[PDB]
Structure 1
Amino acid sequence: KVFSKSVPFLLKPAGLDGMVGDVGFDPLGFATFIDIRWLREAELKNGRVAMLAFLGFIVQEFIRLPGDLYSEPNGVKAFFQVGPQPLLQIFLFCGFLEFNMHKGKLTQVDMFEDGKREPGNFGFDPLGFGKDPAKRERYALAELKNGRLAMIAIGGLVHHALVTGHATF
């Protein structure tokens, strides 16, 4: 028996072999009954959204926009003060982005049905970082780790605002 590298008292999970964040961490075996490509796509998207949202917290409490609506240093209270109209526009824009970036196939059964789709690979690289394949793997691992850390931190900041109410500081 091999046993996992992360959880040393557990057997090595299956389906994670050719990935860019494999430390053998899957005690519940989510990769066995869920497609690993979909799981990586979801992890990357959740991580990127969490990173953007954490940066949004830190900037919102600091900078903010001119106007009476955009005057709440607290993100949770800003979600309510801003009203539904600005939020629904963000929702529709995110939907438009989702549609055009995945080119129609948006669901768990439709995406990766034909393969030829690296999980999380939207081809988005205008600044050109990533031409060298040597640093590409390191950049992918850094993105994954930062995304996970940002998921934890996004939960932390949101719940700090809920239990205190003032801000993050």
Structure 2
Amino acid sequence: VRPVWFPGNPPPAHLDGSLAGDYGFDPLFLGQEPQTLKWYVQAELVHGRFAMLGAAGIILTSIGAKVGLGFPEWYDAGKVVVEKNNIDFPTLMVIQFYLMGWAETKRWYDFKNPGSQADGSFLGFTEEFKGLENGYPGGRFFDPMGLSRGDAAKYQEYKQKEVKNGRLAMIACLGFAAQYAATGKGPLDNLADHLADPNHVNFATNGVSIPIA
């Protein structure tokens, strides 16, 4: 009675409709156990979060290119900011790994113990790192607008919208890499190449996607 990724086939038993963005897509039965599924919900969420941030990053910095601004492409922005700004690179990598190892191990021991990370062991914060549910921490820091409390039905709507935009941002970030490994130029240059001629500047005329050209 609910929509499924493949109409006709029933959804599997471990996958009733309670998660955000559930459509019964597990042909390989990877999340059959409830705890491995509890871990993969967290994984799909945070991959979607980083992919939404990344896709907005590529799209904004490619609107910055081709209009006339001095922005590079996304595959060139790694070099140009460690060379234009005198940034030593392995220390930037180690500072990234320090800050995000902190922020990640906090989450990694919230998964192992949901009521933890909230006993004031950190700098005096008790309810702010409480965690509302799996992959949805909330509180005063992770929800400063406070949209996780109020109308709960609209919060379930926002949960499903987050998962939807996160899925197609993961697909977009998988597609930017393929647009770059195939064509070799910017993504919004590939869009304007597909728009200047809708035929013949698609993937089937790139010489790489189909080898039977």
1:122 aligns with 2:140: no
1:95 aligns with 2:94: no
Q: Deviations over 1:28-48 (max 9, x none)?
A: 211115711111100000001
Q: State the AA in 1 paired with 2:181.
A: L
Q: State the AA in 2 paired with 1:158.
A: A
State how far apart, in whole Å, the 2-side matches of 1:168 and 1:5 are.
31
**Aligned twin of 2:176:** 157
Query: What TM-score do the two structures reach when normalised by structure 1?
Result: 0.75
State how far apart, in whole Å, the 2-side matches of 1:38 and 1:161 are.
32
Deviates more, 1:87-96 or 1:141-150: 87-96
**Aligned twin of 2:53:** 52
Deviates more, 1:55-64 or 1:116-125: 55-64
Q: CA RMSD in A?
A: 2.8
Structure 2 contact 20–159 (Cα < 8 Å) conserved: yes
SS of 2:145's equivalent in the other structure is coil
Q: State the AA in 1 paired with 2:37.
A: I
State how far apart, in whole Å, the 2-side matches of 1:43 and 1:166 are.
29
Gaps of at least 5 residues in structure 1 are 65-70
Gaps of at least 5 residues in structure 2 are 83-88, 116-130, 189-213
**Aligned twin of 2:195:** none
The 5-angstrom pairing of residues 1-169 of structure 1 reads: 5-17=4-16, 18-32=18-32, 35-63=36-64, 73-83=72-82, 84-85=89-90, 87-88=92-93, 89-100=95-106, 102=107, 105=109, 111=111, 113-114=112-113, 118-123=133-138, 124-131=142-149, 132-169=151-188
SS of 1:105's equivalent in the other structure is helix
Rg: which structure is higher?
2
Runs of 4+ in 1 over 6 A off after TM superposition: none
Q: State the AA in 2 paired with 1:36.
A: L
